[PDB]
Structure 1
Amino acid sequence: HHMDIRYFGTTPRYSEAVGANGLIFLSGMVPENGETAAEQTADVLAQIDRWLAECGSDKAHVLDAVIYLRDMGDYAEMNGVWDAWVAAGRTPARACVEARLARPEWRVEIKITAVKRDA
């Protein structure tokens, strides 16, 4: 019935996206490209775009975002990219905290909750 789960980008460890009754949970997305906070933030947001598309959602349908930075010194730099990317008038619940990530060179990780668009 309506609690049925769908899985996207499944690995032995995690799925990139998981969806159930209209809600969408993305794995924490980490940089695949870039060195600077801005470069890495851009790459992470592009991944999010790609995975939200796969789930029948998009950034204008993000409910919540938690942003983990390795170093809170990168706040303004991250924000500059985030601010340009978010859907205006439809910006999500957000929290930003300092936490070290699985690799030392990762400066940002963003964890998204979103909703599947109604047809």
Structure 2
Amino acid sequence: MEPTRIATNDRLSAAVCFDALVFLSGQVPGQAEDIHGQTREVLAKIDALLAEAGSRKERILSATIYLKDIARDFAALNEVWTQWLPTGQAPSRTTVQAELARPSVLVEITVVAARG
């Protein structure tokens, strides 16, 4: 059995599927400049990739959430994140501070999920 890939470029594939597992690349925001908007955009991008890969939000296994400024933005992150999640079905998660590839990026989230 072989890995399959979704949205491949020279650096990464947006998703790699292997058996019943889905590995997503860290997703970054769209055009939003603020933390709330950026978190919404990251999570929307994750939701679409889960769909494309045969998974869904209820089948997320783990999320690592990277914040440029964890002290400043943790509460906003949690607000948007908890809304977006399916009720009673939150995944494992780890939230830490790390600078991302562009200084305007405030949040990036990496998800592993189960195929349905």
TM-score above 0.5, yes or no: yes
SS in 1 for 2:47: helix
Q: Which one of the candidate residues 29, 44, 47 is aligned to 2:42?
A: 44
Aligned residues: 115
Structure 1 runs (4+) greater than 6 angstroms displaced? none
SS in 2 for 1:43: helix
Identity of aligned residues (%): 45
Cα RMSD (Å) of the superposition?
0.6
Structure-2 separation of matches of 1:58 and 1:76: 25
TM-score by length of 1: 0.95
For 2:19, the equivalent position in structure 1 comes to: 21
SS at match of 2:80: helix
Instruction: Name the structure 2 match of 1:112.
Output: 111
C-alpha distance after superposition, 1:5-46 (max 9, x if no partner): 110000110000000010000000001220111100000000
TM-score after normalising by structure 2: 0.97
* CA positional deviation for 1:109: 0.2
1:88 positional shift: 1.4
1:3-22 alignment runs, 5 A limit: 3-22=1-20
- In structure 1, what is the equivalent of residue 100 of structure 2? 101
Q: How does 1:70-81 map to 2 (within 5 A)?
A: 70-72=68-70, 73-81=72-80
Match of 1:86 in 2: 85
For residue 50 of structure 1, what is the amino acid of its counterpart? Answer: A
Unaligned runs of 5+ in 2: none
